Write a protein that binds this ligand. Structure first.
Ligand SMILES: CCCCCCCCCCCCCCCCCC(=O)OC[C@H](COP(=O)([O-])OCC(O)COP(=O)([O-])OC[C@@H](COC(=O)CCCCCCCCCCCCCCCCC)OC(=O)CCCCCCCCCCCCCCCCC)OC(=O)CCCCCCCCCCCCCCCCC
Ligand SMILES: COC1=C(OC)C(=O)C(C/C=C(/C)CC/C=C(/C)CC/C=C(\C)CC/C=C(\C)CC/C=C(/C)CC/C=C(\C)CC/C=C(/C)CC/C=C(\C)CC/C=C(\C)CCC=C(C)C)=C(C)C1=O
Ligand SMILES: CCCCCCCCCCCCCCCCCC(=O)OC[C@H](COP(=O)([O-])OCC[N+](C)(C)C)OC(=O)CCCCCCCCCCCCCCCCC
Ligand SMILES: NC(=O)C1=CN([C@@H]2O[C@H](COP(=O)(O)OP(=O)(O)OC[C@H]3O[C@@H](n4cnc5c(N)ncnc54)[C@H](OP(=O)(O)O)[C@@H]3O)[C@@H](O)[C@H]2O)C=CC1
Ligand SMILES: CCCCCCCCCCC[C@H](O)CC(=O)SCCNC(=O)CCNC(=O)[C@H](O)C(C)(C)COP(=O)(O)O
Ligand code: SF4
Ligand code: SF4
Ligand code: SF4
Ligand SMILES: [Zn+2]
Lengths: 115, 176, 45, 209, 48, 155, 60, 96, 238, 95, 342, 42
């Protein structure tokens, strides 16, 4: 029924807690990768990208779900500070080559039959 | 049953000890290797010089495809799509149409030689022996587009290697 | 007619060696040292 | 045997394993939910998820079972079943030259205790299952992607995942680095509806729901 | 071939060709099918 | 005429390159193992001038032989960028010619060319150790037919 | 001291693609699986399919 | 057989021919549009019709197993010579 | 070639004789390899007592094949659970004692010679008969009955378009592949296509044990440990 | 391309064996590449009577996995009798 | 629109954008990026070339199969141009070099052939010819290059009235020969600037923006006849620009004055090399030519492309020139240079 | 049934946060749930 087995967190609050030290670690992590990975973006240009994912992932309310991606974020952070990823992998977050996609209905109508 | 492989305890007799001591001091198994290679130096090299002479094959070899045609000249492919239905790489792409004569041939027979893996299922598939890989293992091209064969190239390969396919299939049509 | 396949000849096949056939060759260990010393003595002389 | 095509049947093995099925069921009635032996003499031990650690230790340590080799650790994602994923273990008993299969069920969210302690082989199998399917395994030494590319999102072996995927790759010169783009096939995968509209096996006919 | 001549037929080529990649005789793929959707040709008579 | 001496220096330079190109030690999958048979005594690639040197800093032709996937595509292009000029890349086998058997999967780049400027395409699954033996020699003809200085003297 | 063996540089989605192919079409997958023991690879797949089909191969 | 398009292209057996504008035509320039001359359509018409006398006639296509599945053409309609659907060989009754 | 229900087609005439000629020559080269390395001191030091794995940990690590036979565990699927006609063939399974890198090298080389005995028996005891299951609903009919019989053509059509529909069920069949215990877990819904195919790769379990082996050994040893493990990355990456 | 007898001894002596008895390079001993047409046999079920599929099929004779207990004194029983320890080889004991 | 040119598919590698481009002289700095954007959206590019096909290999892996087909053309033969631009709708002209080869004068590669493509394209039936010429193009400029471009614009406009003329300022990028020019100046002692280069204001523009400018111009139905001037956001005095470059490269800056007649002599000496010249008398003049401001000329923001300041994407060009010492140094280490603004 | 701190979660299950479906393919796409029609020619 409603009773489900929680992963680590026991309600929203410490689920809200775990997203913090992920942000705590990510924020401390940005400037050294920009140096180590020889990135083209600025130190400022990394914090927003770290930031914008977080409230992009904001409609989520289930405590089990919240703890599930905080592990994925931790793993992504894990596979970043050992330079396991590469310049291309990190840059894939910046949708650079992909041209901007329209948003208004009229532009959708002009390009092709798609919602 | 099983056989033990390496636990052979060496003897400690003075003859055996001096033999091992001579082996370690006066390197022998190292010389045994040198004498081995020298013996294997005066052999006849297994190499064959390229295209002037070529390696040996079998009549059922699988290579560049070809779309043969009947002794009359009419193409064998009646476009049953069996080869497309069995293609493991989905390289076969064919569409048929009622031809002007009324016969049942295919408008398009693009075989993508960059997808299919030469399973040979296609030659096993069509009940009219229409598609078949030729013995020509050599069709390397300089551009990617050249490998994407259409129906026209397939028929040209059929008209070029027809002597081999008739002979090779004649040899192996009894084994299958 | 007669069924013909790639069956082995009636006498089966010749015996196939599989056991290790690593030959043993060379002088005795005492002899190797003996001749080695012999050249040394000749060289010194 | 007059029949030259039908695979021979081994009833002695069938009876032998079925008796061992009653054995394991009686020893651990707390986790074992169902036990069956297939027609080709394979025993499936249907356990409850919390029994992953206790049951496995029994077959690995009990004198009369002695299953001391983790053959494989897989899951078959069934979108139909309420808890979709179904984690499957295969164990081989060296002493009794027999194979057993303990199968357990799990949804996307509920975690399964890692069998690394009872079977240290499971450790790398543990990582693959999460990577391909998304079943998170609790208290694991190091859960991480093992197969997919670094930063790859989604769980590929999941049925809802498309065959071609979502992300392609190519070299783009204005950035002088490999970049990811939305998938755009030069040829869509021609799906084939190759299912006979006639019943194939009266023996396995589902009840008339 | 001198001892056993291959069976000769009409469509068999009379001049073997090497692989023609590189040279301007190279093969270029192209769709062998006809057009699927044509268009309604506008009339020639004027608007009125 | 300066055209004559340019052509003579043209022939001298490329002949050195086509008779001394060194295929890298770059194997991937099923397509790589039979390429060893080319280097095996049966066909003896080395007799045609090539040597199988590692270290892309000291190699000319890159034998992309096997399935090119997503996780390694950055590694290959880094490797290709490290190779000095001139450099050639022979896409070997159907997997590296467009995706091969796994053309439609999720972690394979459909074609080695999407990462690297790919030279002569040798097909096969796998191409016989002889099939690309021609592939290497056919590249030697491509090296023979270049102009380089001929363009420079006419630039 | 510690060796982390990152694999995946050759992860063709073999077990994913087999889902979309018939049993006959899935055979070359195993051929490509362990490309130095080809006949042994198909032998594994063939025995499994024969077991499920409840059918034995002829003695030859 | 192979005709010539108004642009200069060669129509294939299917009748495919890139038209006047047809930006795709750029590929054939500095190259050739591969066309097979042995057109199957007119390579079967000149074959004579067999005058065999019966009502049902089999057609193996030649070579037995080398041919096509044996089909029985009904040579009864005395207006049109029966043809095998696999090879196009026309069979007809010897006009009684 | 090896398909469900039997092989695709019979061997060409004279193939077995060509096998006999090669098998005669081979044992005169296997010992030649042993002459080069087996007693060579440099090869010995590079391989003796290096990358040593014990019995229980190797068994627990999911190892198979040489990893078991090299460390003393007398296990072999060809003997314990013989598939096909492996029971009717006599052969020995080399078992090591030290379990290190070197002992496996002899185990593999001895497996060479033991295989030669198997080949000798297979050639001498080849039985006459067909090469595929007589059941045409499982194995495609020959081209001869294809082109004359209704039922054969119908079966060939459906077999190469739909394929044989296997009964629902799941099974895990493992064989003593040269690397190790290669096994497949096939789950079938009952349609003409498999529902899930997990592929137990012998190198998958092996390679997880790389760290346990290479403990205190230098990098050059790790190169040696990779070689003895006999890994090819098509099987492990699946 | 047969070696001169002078070096036939050299290769034989330097390796301590007779190479010429069995060489890696093949020669005329190989089977001819052209063979007579073979006649393949028929299967056991190629009988024109008493070959009904109902008494010959293998697929339709598989029952659903037999169920022995569902969650819906007896002697201890092992899955199979313990293996019998392999005997030592007879053709080649300890290497 | 022809049925084979109707736009199709979401913009991507396999998408049919509907553009049959004929980018002339794509085997160069500007040509490298324009095809990349053309290849990205999916557009048959004819990409004629004259050099060795090997030098065109990097042009290959930026489009779908059969989309970057190559053709061999000669600058002094009309027939080669007609074949290259026969079946097309958009022609991009990027021909032109910064030196004077014996077989091609400056006026040639900027009037003679650019006249040839311009005239033949109109006869063939092209509709969107886009010819590129320097922004500073003056009829009476001290440098022949800048003179030849100006007369070049006049002639192509006459032959092809509806030919969009793009007027870029100095373009910087990885292989730009503008930032690299000053970066390479470190080899010959110090950095010689005439009157310390304190009376020359330059307004460079990043390469990609002009590349997107050409692409947007093709799509834009109003580019017919117009003459765009592609310029960067900020103007920098040349001395401060060189200060910025050497700061980003962290190489020491050693400016020293040099009279104009002596620099012209230095440019003469460097022209002697029978290979790619490093600095010509014409090049010396260009460094002195300050980018004339043409506000009446429609700029870059009207197209839609927002200019990228050189401060952001400067390490791309100059990271290579840095020694191992300051190789990992980031952008914020060096402050933005002062900009004399309009 | 497990004594594993059974929290009574009530919010409807939503794993779209993790499956990785890109933004375009998760909202815009509409799926249809139906029983396939009997192929009339069979
Ligand atoms: C050490 C060199 C000693 C002097 C030459 C004797 C020698 O090496 O004989 C090799 C000769 C050839 O090798 P083989 O394997 O015995 O030949 C087997 C077939 O008969 C081989 O049959 P085949 O048909 O190959 O025989 C033809 C072959 C025959 O080739 C020869 O006879 C080689 C001698 C030059 C002619 O000639 C060629 O193939 C023509 C190409 C020759 C290449 C260049 C040779 C240069 C020789 C040295 C030049 C000066 C330095 O071996 C012997 O005759 C053994 C005796 C060696 C005596 C050593 C005394 C010290
Ligand atoms: C992973 O994948 C892999 C593959 O595939 C993808 C493979 O296939 C294979 C299989 C292929 C093989 C060949 C097996 C061996 C290959 C390996 C990589 C295994 C590891 C190798 C080794 C341990 C051994 C390596 C040995 C080497 C490199 C040999 C070195 C020695 C040589 C003699 C060969 C090289 C010779 C050269 C370069 C020629 C001479 C050099 C010159 C510079 C030319 C001369 C120049 C001058 C004279 C200067 C100019 C001056 C002049 C003319 C004088 C006059 C003028 C004046 C001005 C004075 C493997 C193993 C593999 O793992
Ligand atoms: C001892 C060797 C004696 C013979 C040496 C001949 C010179 C070889 C130099 C290397 C190749 C370049 C060359 O030949 O000319 C340089 C010339 C230089 O002018 P280029 O314009 O042809 O250079 C190539 C094209 N770019 C500039 C874009 C890189 O290059 C070529 O010939 C290559 C084409
Ligand atoms: N900052 C800048 O560089 C600016 C440049 N421009 C103009 O833009 C154009 C392209 O600039 P950019 O890409 O940097 O130049 P590059 O020199 O890098 O490239 C020039 C291109 O033109 C070709 N080409 C040159 N001369 C000839 C010739 N005689 N015959 C045939 N092809 C020839 C070259 O081929 P190949 O490489 O084989 O010689 C190459 O494809 C030039 O006209 C330039 O003046 C305009 C404004 C600013
Ligand atoms: C260069 C690249 C660098 C790397 C680039 C970034 C790499 C990836 C980083 C991780 C991305 C991952 O998808 C998400 C994660 O880790 S965690 C999501 C947290 N989700 C919640 O907590 C519940 C919903 N949201 C709220 O509850 C609140 O709205 C919020 C927390 C937003 C603000 O809190 P406030 O109290 O309202
Ligand atoms: S050979 Fe096999 S994979 Fe290739 S096209 Fe034919 S059926 Fe398909
Ligand atoms: S080639 Fe064969 S399988 Fe394919 S459509 Fe023609 S007859 Fe059928
Ligand atoms: S092309 Fe074929 S042989 Fe080569 S790697 Fe791919 S699947 Fe293996
Ligand atoms: Zn017929």
């Amino acid at each position: 029924g409603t009773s489900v087995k929680p992963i680590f967190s026991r309600d929203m609050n410490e689920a809200k807690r775990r997203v913090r030290e992920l942000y705590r670690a990510w924020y401390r992590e940005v400037p050294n990768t920009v140096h180590l990975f020889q990135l083209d973006i600025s130190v400022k240009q990394g914090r927003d990208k770290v930031r914008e994912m977080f409230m992009k992932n904001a409609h989520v309310t289930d405590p089990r779900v919240v703890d599930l991606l905080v592990i994925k974020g931790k793993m992504e952070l894990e596979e970043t500070i050992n330079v396991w990823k590469q310049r291309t992998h990190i840059m894939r977050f910046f949708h650079e080559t992909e041209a901007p996609r329209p948003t208004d209905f009229l532009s959708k109508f002009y390009v092709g039959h798609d919602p | 049953t099983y056989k033990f492989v390496n636990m052979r305890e060496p003897s400690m007799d003075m003859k055996s000890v001096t033999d091992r001591a001579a082996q370690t001091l006066l390197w022998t198994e190292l010389v045994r290797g040198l004498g081995m290679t020298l013996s294997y130096l005066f052999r006849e090299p297994a190499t064959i010089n390229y295209p002037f002479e070529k390696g040996p094959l079998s009549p059922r070899f699988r290579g560049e495809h070809a779309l043969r045609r009947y002794p009359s000249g009419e193409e064998r492919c009646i476009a049953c799509k069996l080869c497309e239905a069995v293609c493991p790489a989905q390289a076969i792409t064919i569409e048929a149409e009622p031809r002007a004569d009324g016969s049942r041939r295919t408008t398009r027979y693009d075989i993508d030689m960059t997808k299919c893996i030469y399973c040979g299922f296609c030659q096993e598939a069509c009940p009219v022996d229409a598609i078949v890989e030729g013995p020509n293992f050599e069709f390397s091209t300089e551009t990617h587009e050249e490998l994407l064969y259409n129906k026209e190239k397939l028929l040209n390969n059929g008209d070029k290697w027809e002597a081999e396919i008739a002979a090779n299939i004649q040899a192996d049509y009894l084994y299958r | 007619s007669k069924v013909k396949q790639d069956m082995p000849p009636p006498g089966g096949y010749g015996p196939i060696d599989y056991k290790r056939n690593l030959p043993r060759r060379g002088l005795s260990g005492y002899s190797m040292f003996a001749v080695g010393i012999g050249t040394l003595l000749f060289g010194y002389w | 045997d007059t029949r030259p095509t039908i695979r021979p049947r081994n009833d002695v093995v069938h009876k032998q394993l079925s008796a061992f099925g009653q054995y394991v069921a009686e020893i651990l009635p707390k986790y074992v939910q169902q036990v069956q032996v297939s027609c080709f003499n394979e025993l499936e031990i249907f356990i409850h998820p919390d029994g992953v650690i206790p049951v496995l230790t029994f077959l690995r340590d009990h004198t009369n079972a002695q299953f001391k080799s983790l053959a494989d650790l897989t899951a078959v994602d069934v979108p139909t079943r309420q808890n979709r994923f179904e984690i499957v273990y295969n164990l081989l008993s060296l002493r009794f030259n027999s194979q057993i299969r303990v199968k357990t069920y799990t949804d996307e969210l509920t975690p399964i205790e890692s069998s690394v302690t009872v079977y240290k082989a499971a450790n790398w199998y543990e990582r693959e299952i999460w990577d391909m399917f998304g079943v998170f395994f609790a208290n694991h030494p190091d859960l991480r992607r093992i197969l997919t590319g670094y930063g790859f999102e989604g769980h590929p072996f999941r049925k809802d995942f498309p065959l071609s995927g979502y992300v392609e790759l190519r070299y783009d010169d204005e950035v002088k680095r490999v970049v990811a783009e939305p998938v755009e096939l030069a040829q869509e995968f021609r799906k084939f509806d190759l299912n006979s509209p006639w019943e194939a096996f009266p023996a396995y006919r589902q009840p008339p729901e | 071939p001198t001892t056993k001549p291959p069976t000769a037929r009409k469509y068999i080529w009379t001049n073997h060709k090497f692989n023609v990649s590189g040279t301007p005789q190279q093969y270029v793929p192209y769709s062998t099918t006809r057009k699927k959707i044509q268009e309604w040709v506008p009339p020639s008579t004027p608007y009125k | 005429r300066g055209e004559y001496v340019v052509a003579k220096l043209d022939d001298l330079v490329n002949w050195a390159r086509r008779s001394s190109l060194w295929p890298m030690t770059f194997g991937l999958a099923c397509c790589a193992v039979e390429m060893m048979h080319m280097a095996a005594p049966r066909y003896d690639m080395d007799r045609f001038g090539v040597v199988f040197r590692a270290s892309p800093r000291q190699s000319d032709v890159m034998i992309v032989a096997g399935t090119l996937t997503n996780k390694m595509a950055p590694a290959l292009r880094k490797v290709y960028d490290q190779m000095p000029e001139p450099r050639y890349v022979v896409s070997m086998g159907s997997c590296a010619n467009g995706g091969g058997y796994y053309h439609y999967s999720y972690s394979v780049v459909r074609g080695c060319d999407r990462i690297v400027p790919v030279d002569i395409y040798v097909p096969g699954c796998p191409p016989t150790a002889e099939a690309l033996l021609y592939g290497i020699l056919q590249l030697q003809r491509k090296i023979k037919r270049e102009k380089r200085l001929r363009i420079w003297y006419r630039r | 001291r510690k060796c982390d063996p990152h694999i995946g540089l050759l992860h063709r989605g073999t077990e994913k693609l087999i889902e979309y192919k018939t049993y006959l079409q899935a055979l070359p997958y195993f051929d490509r699986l362990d490309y130095v023991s080809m006949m042994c690879n198909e032998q594994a797949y063939s025995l499994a399919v024969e077991k499920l089909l409840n059918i034995q191969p002829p003695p030859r | 057989g192979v005709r010539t398009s108004p642009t200069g292209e060669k129509v294939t057996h299917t009748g495919q021919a890139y038209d006047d504008g047809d930006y795709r035509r750029v590929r054939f320039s500095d190259r050739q549009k591969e066309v097979n001359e042995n057109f199957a359509i007119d390579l079967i018409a000149e074959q004579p019709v067999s005058e065999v006398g019966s009502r049902v006639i089999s057609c193996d296509g030649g070579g037995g197993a080398l041919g096509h599945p044996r089909v029985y053409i009904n040579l009864d309609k005395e207006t049109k010579t029966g043809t095998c659907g696999y090879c196009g060989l026309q069979f007809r009754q010897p006009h009684h | 070639y090896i398909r469900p229900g039997g092989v695709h087609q019979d061997l060409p005439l004279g193939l077995l004789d060509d096998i006999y000629e090669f098998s005669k020559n081979f044992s005169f080269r296997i010992d030649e390899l042993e002459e080069m390395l087996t007693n060579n001191r440099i090869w010995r030091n590079r391989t003796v007592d290096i990358g040593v794995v014990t019995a229980e940990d190797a068994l627990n690590y999911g190892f198979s094949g040489v990893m078991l036979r090299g460390s003393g565990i007398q296990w072999d699927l060809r003997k314990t659970q013989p598939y096909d006609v492996y029971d009717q063939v006599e052969f020995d399974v080399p078992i090591g004692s030290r379990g290190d890198c070197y002992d496996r090298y002899l185990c593999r080389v001895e497996e060479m010679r033991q295989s030669l005995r198997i080949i000798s028996q297979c050639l001498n005891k080849m039985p006459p008969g067909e090469i595929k299951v007589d059941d045409a609903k499982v194995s495609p009919p020959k081209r001869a009955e294809m082109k004359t019989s209704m039922e054969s053509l119908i079966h060939h059509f459906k077999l190469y378009t739909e394929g044989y529909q296997v009964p629902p069920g799941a099974t895990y069949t493992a064989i003593e592949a040269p690397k190790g215990e290669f096994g497949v877990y096939l789950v079938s819904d009952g349609s003409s296509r498999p529902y899930r195919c997990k592929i137990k790769a012998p190198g998958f379990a092996h390679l997880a044990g790389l760290d346990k082996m290479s403990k205190g050994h230098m990098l050059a040893d790790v190169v040696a440990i990779i070689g003895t493990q006999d890994i090819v990355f098509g099987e492990v990456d699946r | 391309a047969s070696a001169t007898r002078v070096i036939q001894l050299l290769r034989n002596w330097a390796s301590g064996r007779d190479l010429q008895a069995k060489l890696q390079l093949r020669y005329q001993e190989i089977s001819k590449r052209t063979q007579p047409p073979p006649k393949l046999p028929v299967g056991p079920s190629h009988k024109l009577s008493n070959n009904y599929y109902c008494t010959r099929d293998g697929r339709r004779e598989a029952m659903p996995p037999s169920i022995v207990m569902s969650s819906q004194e007896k002697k201890a029983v092992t899955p199979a009798p313990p293996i019998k320890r392999w005997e030592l080889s007879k053709d080649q004991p300890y290497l | 629109l022809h049925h084979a040119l109707i736009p199709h598919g979401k913009g991507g590698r396999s998408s049919v954008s509907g553009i049959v481009a004929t980018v002339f002289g794509a085997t160069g700095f500007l040509g490298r990026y324009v095809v990349n954007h053309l290849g990205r959206m999916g557009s048959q590019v004819i990409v004629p070339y004259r050099c060795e096909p090997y030098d065109t290999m990097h042009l290959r892996p930026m489009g779908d199969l059969g989309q970057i087909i190559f053709m061999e053309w000669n600058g002094k033969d009309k027939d080669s141009i007609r074949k290259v631009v026969e079946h097309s709708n958009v022609v991009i002209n990027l021909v032109g070099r910064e030196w004077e080869t014996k077989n091609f004068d400056f006026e040639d590669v900027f009037v003679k052939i650019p006249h040839a493509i311009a005239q033949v394209s109109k006869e063939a039936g092209v509709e969107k010819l886009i010819h590129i010429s320097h922004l500073n193009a003056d009829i009476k400029s001290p440098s022949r290059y800048l003179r030849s471009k100006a007369v070049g614009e006049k002639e192509v406009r006459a032959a092809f009235p509806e030919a969009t003329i793009i007027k870029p300022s100095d373009i910087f990028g990885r292989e730009d020969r503008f930032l690299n020019y000053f970066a390479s100046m470190r080899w010959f002692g110090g950095v010689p600037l005439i009157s310390l280069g304190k009376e020359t204001v330059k307004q460079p523009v990043y390469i990609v923006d002009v590349s997107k400018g050409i692409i947007n111009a093709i799509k834009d139905p109003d580019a017919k006849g117009k003459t765009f001037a592609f310029v960067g956001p900020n103007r920098y005095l040349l001395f401060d620009l060189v200060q910025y470059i050497f700061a980003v490269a962290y190489r020491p800056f050693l400016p020293y004055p040099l009279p104009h007649f002596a620099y012209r002599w230095v440019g003469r000496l460097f022209e002697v090399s029978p290979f790619e010249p490093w600095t010509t008398r014409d090049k010396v003049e260009r460094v002195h030519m300050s980018d004339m401001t043409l506000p009446h000329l429609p700029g870059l923001e009207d197209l839609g492309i927002q200019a990228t300041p050189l401060e952001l994407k400067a390490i791309e060009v100059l990271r290579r020139h840095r020694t191992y010492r300051w190789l990992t140094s980031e952008m914020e280490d060096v402050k933005p240079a002062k900009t004399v603004n309009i | 049934t497990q004594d594993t701190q059974l929290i009574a979660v009530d919010e409807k299950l939503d794993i779209t946060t993790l499956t990785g479906v890109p933004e375009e393919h998760i909202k815009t796409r509409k799926v249809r749930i139906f029983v396939p029609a009997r192929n009339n020619m069979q």
